Amino acid sequence: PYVEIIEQPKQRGMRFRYKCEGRSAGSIPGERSTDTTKTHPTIKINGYTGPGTVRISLVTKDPPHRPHPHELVGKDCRDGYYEADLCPDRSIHSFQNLGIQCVKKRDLEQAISQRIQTNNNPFHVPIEEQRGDYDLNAVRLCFQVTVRDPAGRPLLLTPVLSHPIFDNRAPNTAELKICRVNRNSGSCLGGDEIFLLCDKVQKEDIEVYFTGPGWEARGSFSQADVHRQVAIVFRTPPYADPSLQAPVRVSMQLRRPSDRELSEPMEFQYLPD
Amino acid sequence: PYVEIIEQPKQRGMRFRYKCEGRSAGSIPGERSTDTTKTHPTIKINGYTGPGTVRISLVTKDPPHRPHPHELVGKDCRDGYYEADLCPDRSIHSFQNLGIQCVKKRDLEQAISQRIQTNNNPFHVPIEEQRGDYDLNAVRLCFQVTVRDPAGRPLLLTPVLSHPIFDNRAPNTAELKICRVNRNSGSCLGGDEIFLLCDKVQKEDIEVYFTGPGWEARGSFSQADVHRQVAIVFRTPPYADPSLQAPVRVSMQLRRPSDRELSEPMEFQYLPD
DNA sequence: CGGCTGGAAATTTCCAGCCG
DNA sequence: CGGCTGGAAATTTCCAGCCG
After folding, report:
1. Do B227 and A227 touch (CB under 8 A)?
2. Using an 8 Å Cβ cutoff, are A230 and B226 in contact?
């Protein structure tokens, strides 16, 4: 029999709570889960109906897939994994109640120790490999279903892993926002210096992207002009038509190179010089 | 004889480094230091020359001078205090390799037990009156010099403290710096909105203080206008005289109410409306 | 109306670029 | 080298506006 993932966890949007951030750790939602239409990581077991159990371990994003040092927490969880006895009355299973608790880089080796002890190693990565560089900001759910064989004896199906989940409370995964701007208008020749206040960005990865219908231009600044990740001082780019004779609304917005990700558009209105 | 401080340690702009950064910290410069002519904490022993020793403990900022949890680190340091043989043919003493290593709040209790065990209590504060919170953002060096008397026996002179050395890590005890400003000129009628980029302030304890001979005025903004502690968007106050006939350069600077502290003055040049 | 939880901040580690 | 730095991560604790 074989497990299928008919609903992957939302790749970006969840934040790993340290075992200190309050009482909640979250509840990983599905790839198409909205503030109205809530979906969740669901699997389908092809070719089997009846008694069985499900275990959701966490494993490294990358190919040598060792058990991750972070923990899964919530209903039915224990020692960093989930484990609920499946339902015979259904074949499509959803989990609308699981959270990803990140551990401190300091307590990483005490995490993996517990991985060993509790026999949590979906892909039985030999001990000599428990060592290495654990990418703490990306995990993969590893659904390991157990159904019965013809003789009724428990039959462990192969492991099925999801695509990476990503900790929002991380450098590049946080959202883009333009809180304030000293000026929303300027000259079509550009050159106007603009002070834009935003949310924590990375001077190494950020852009002020200007756009209109068929037009495109970046504002000019540098890493030096990105004051405390939360303010950028740059200069507007020239407009398409330089010798304007009337205004032209275009839209200004923050753009992150790495992801091609944008912020809500702030109307900028180029004017005749 | 009696010790005096010919040169106090620079009160601000220096962050205290933790052990996780090194058993050696930058080194406290003299209050009168500048890129060109470097200065260091110096003391003068009035009425004595020849054999002697000098210990530099750290003690709390306010009156009951309990030995601080923090520790001094650098040449000739050990157990959180400096110690060294006084030059016997000189009377002015410089200390150019002194660093302040801040302990973690958690490790505070281990800190003071070390003060006890090593008998570091310049002002002999009893265990009774040692109890209390320790302001970990402000310390004071406490030079304890020992010379000999004519008969020849070691004579411990009384203790002399410096003025607080403030850890920049703390925005209320830190050095107000104005990094950038979109405009340094405006109208005598005021009203010009200004975007000023500074170092970590505290929305509810910061001010943009304008000034001139017989004139002072605050800029208008609110806590809502203090973006993520490192930017203030305010509006310039009217000048003393609205009938200017030519630029009148006053000085703009950050002021912190809690301690009436100021930042280096940025020239602002009011102009005729 | 006070107890629950983002968003702000305070606190601690780590790191790159540098300058003598 | 290495020690400085200054800046930003990593982590933890704060806090005000919810909410009921």
Report:
1. no
2. no
B3, containing H or E segment: strand B2-7
Chain position carrying tokens 């040092």: A69
Nearest to B95 by CA among B148, B144, B155: B144
- Residues in A closer than 8 angstroms to B195, CB to CB, are 182, 195, 197
Contact B227 A231 (CB under 8 A): yes
**B30 Cα to chain A: minimum distance (Å):** 29
A/B interface, count of CB pairs below 8 Å: 37
CA angle B243, B244, B250 (to 5 degrees): 125
Instruction: Tally the C-alpha atoms within 13 A of residue B42's C-alpha that lie toward its C-beta.
Output: 15
Per the structure block, which two tokens stand in for A254? 């923050």
CA angle, B56 then B59 then B60, to 5°: 160
Rg of chain A (C-alpha set): 25
Give Cα B192 distance to the centre of its chain: 34
Q: Which H or E element spans position A112? A: helix A108-117
Q: What is the DSSP string of A119-179?
A: T--TT---GGGS-S---TTEEEEEEEEEEE-TTSSEEEPPPEE---EEESSSTTTSPP-EE
Distance of CA A217 to the CA centre of its chain: 28
For residues B239 and B250, the answer to whether their CB atoms sit within 8 Å is yes
Alpha-carbon distance A101 to A19, whole Å?
A: 7
Please tell me what resolution, in angstroms, this structure has: 2.7
**Judging by DSSP bridges, how do beta strands B226-227 and B92-94 pair with one another?**
unpaired
In whole angstroms, what is the distance from residue A137 CA to residue A128 CA?
Answer: 23
Instruction: Give B200-256 as a 3 state SS string.
Output: CCCHHHCEEEEEECCEEEECECCHHHEECCCEEEEECCCCCCCCCCCCEEEEEEEEE
Domains of chain B: 1-169 (2.60.40.340), 173-267 (2.60.40.10)
How far is the C-alpha of B99 from the C-alpha of B70, rounded, in Å? 10
Residue window 170-189, chain A: list those with CB within 8 Å of chain B.
179-180, 182
Burial readout B94-133 (b: 16 or more C-beta within 10 A, e: otherwise):
ebebbbbbbbeeeeeeebbebbeeeebbbbebeeeebeee
